[PDB]
Amino acid sequence: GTHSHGLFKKLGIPGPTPLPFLGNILSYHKGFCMFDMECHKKYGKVWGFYDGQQPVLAITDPDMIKTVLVKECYSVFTNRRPFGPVGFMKSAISIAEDEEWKRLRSLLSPTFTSGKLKEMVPIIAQYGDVLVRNLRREAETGKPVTLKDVFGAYSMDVITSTSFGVNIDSLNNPQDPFVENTKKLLRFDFLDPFFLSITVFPFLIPILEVLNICVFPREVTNFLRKSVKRMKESRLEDTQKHRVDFLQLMIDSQNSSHKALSDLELVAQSIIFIFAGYETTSSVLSFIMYELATHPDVQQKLQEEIDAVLPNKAPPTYDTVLQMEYLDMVVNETLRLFPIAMRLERVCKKDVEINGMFIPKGVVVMIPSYALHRDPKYWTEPEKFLPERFSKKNKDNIDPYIYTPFGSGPRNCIGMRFALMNMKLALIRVLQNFSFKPCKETQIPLKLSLGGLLQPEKPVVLKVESRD
């Protein structure tokens, strides 16, 4: 069982000594972030470890990161770490490899332009108003408020309407078929027993694929495949009600070099957009409101900036959202402290030599975002929430390969601008109406989960008083 455990020694690369069969997974007992921080302060700029038999090489040099993420992306570092069983979701752009990905990224790029986003802003803002009416019902009743519930329902409303044109107040329709299914698309905890078992027994993945066992649950995928079918037909009939959702943008793409999106590929992308945006958006928004509640000074200044740009609670628009600097600064600093990706990864497909370091075929090159976002070498007082880092005066010292909450290069986050616009639109409408103060039962300082997802240990609960 000590087959490949000798790689990093032959190359002279340091790291924690692995155990037979297990590799270094027992060190994940405090999550990915704490393991990366510990390895960083312990072994320096580069180190190696083993997820079972799989070797992983961590890199922290911003010149080296640029070579992996940008310069040699097509040639060597094109794909992410394999995982499964994935079934047909192999066709999702985030999972596809080599030429299949390059084609899918080429097909989906016009869907995420600033023009299509501009046409989605009125839809997103509608549920910012819905978010305020539900927040006010929990504010006129003096009761502590679980953020991820009210931000989860907001993210759900934005997803259903901007990806399928389905318009629901999901907080008050918890058993609409579209809401209960979409709510089941929970992010993967790679440290739970099932995924840790697969990590230790990767040879069992082909056995699960032949039995049609899938990490994306069949019941939800079957419901969306048929729902897309019914919408693709009905949209052909009533063809006067113009739509501006991802489904409609992808339906149109099939009406043109590359092959057009197949009907199954189209479903795969629609599903992966939900996974990408649903718990991510609500998690970040909760992190933001925590930092705003623990720093009343920052919250007031943002509320003053919003009222200067949008007097009299004027509705946020596309151009006015991008106008607010302190809002962008608050969002960025919160993502520095809580980069929910935790890591960026690329599989080394060829025996390569970059920046003087030899990297052999099969190694997973990893960029530890959570650690680099808190590295004293680039951030003074990294544990403190200080949005002034991202002011126009100081944003020249921020290295774009140390700060990668959306990745970088050709395979970065394709929904970055959408996610930023979505979160800011929510933040503006919420702060125009409310202020957020800690409870007695608020966890200060916030503690992170020991699991495989960057989320609070306990839910963030805050008191919400109206600005009336």
Ligand X SMILES: Cn1c(=O)c2c(ncn2C)n(C)c1=O
Site residues (CB under 6 A) for ligand X, limited to 45-64: 51
Among ligand X, its own copies, ligand HEM, none, residue 441 binds (CB under 5-8 Å by kind): none
Among 187, 235, 313, 437, binds ligand X (CB under 6 A): 187
**Options 183-191, 200-208, 428-436, 443-451: segment touching its own copies (CB under 8 A):** 200-208
Q: In the complex, what is the shortest distance from the CB of residue 382 to ligand HEM, in angstroms, rounded to a whole number?
A: 19
Q: In the complex, what is the shortest distance from the CB of residue 112 to its own copies, in angstroms, rounded to a whole number?
A: 26
Among 53, 155, 199, 442, binds ligand X (CB under 6 A): 199
Verify binding: residue 190, ligand X, rule CB under 6 A: yes
Among 14, 42, 194, 397, binds ligand X (CB under 6 A): 194
- Beta carbons within 8 Å of 412's beta carbon, 6+ residues apart: 69, 406
Site residues (CB under 8 A) for its own copies, limited to 329-388: 350
**Options 106-114, 155-163, 187-195, 253-261: segment touching ligand X (CB under 6 A):** 187-195
Verify binding: residue 217, ligand X, rule CB under 6 A: yes
Site residues (CB under 6 A) for ligand HEM, limited to 328-387: 340-341, 344
**CA separation for the pair 54, 345 (Å, rounded):** 13
Distances (CA, A) of 22 to 52, 58, 201: 5, 19, 10
- Beta carbons within 8 Å of 172's beta carbon, 6+ residues apart: 134
Task: State the binding string over 80-99 for ligand HEM (x if CB under 6 A, else -).
Answer: -------------xx-----
Among its own copies, ligand X, ligand HEM, none, residue 71 binds (CB under 5-8 Å by kind): none
Among 405, 424, 436, 452, binds ligand HEM (CB under 6 A): 405
Tell me: is residue 413 an annotated ligand-binding position. Answer: yes
Q: In the complex, what is the shortest distance from the CB of residue 248 to its own copies, in angstroms, rounded to a whole number?
A: 28
Verify binding: residue 206, its own copies, rule CB under 8 A: yes
Site residues (CB under 8 A) for its own copies, limited to 84-123: 99
Nearer to its own copies, 72 or 245 (CB): 72
Tokens 């009600």 belong to residue: 241
Among ligand X, ligand HEM, its own copies, none, residue 187 binds (CB under 5-8 Å by kind): ligand X
**CA separation for the pair 265, 453 (Å, rounded):** 27
Verify binding: residue 209, its own copies, rule CB under 8 A: yes
Verify binding: residue 210, its own copies, rule CB under 8 A: yes
Binding site for its own copies (CB under 8 A): 99, 202-204, 206-207, 209-210, 350
* Site of interaction with ligand HEM (CB under 6 A): 93-94, 105, 272-273, 276-277, 280-281, 284, 340-341, 344, 405-408, 411-415, 418-419
Binding residues for heme: 413
Residues that bind ligand X (CB under 6 A): 51, 81, 83, 94, 187-188, 190, 192, 194, 199, 215, 217, 272, 275-276, 280, 340-341, 345
Name the binding residues.
413
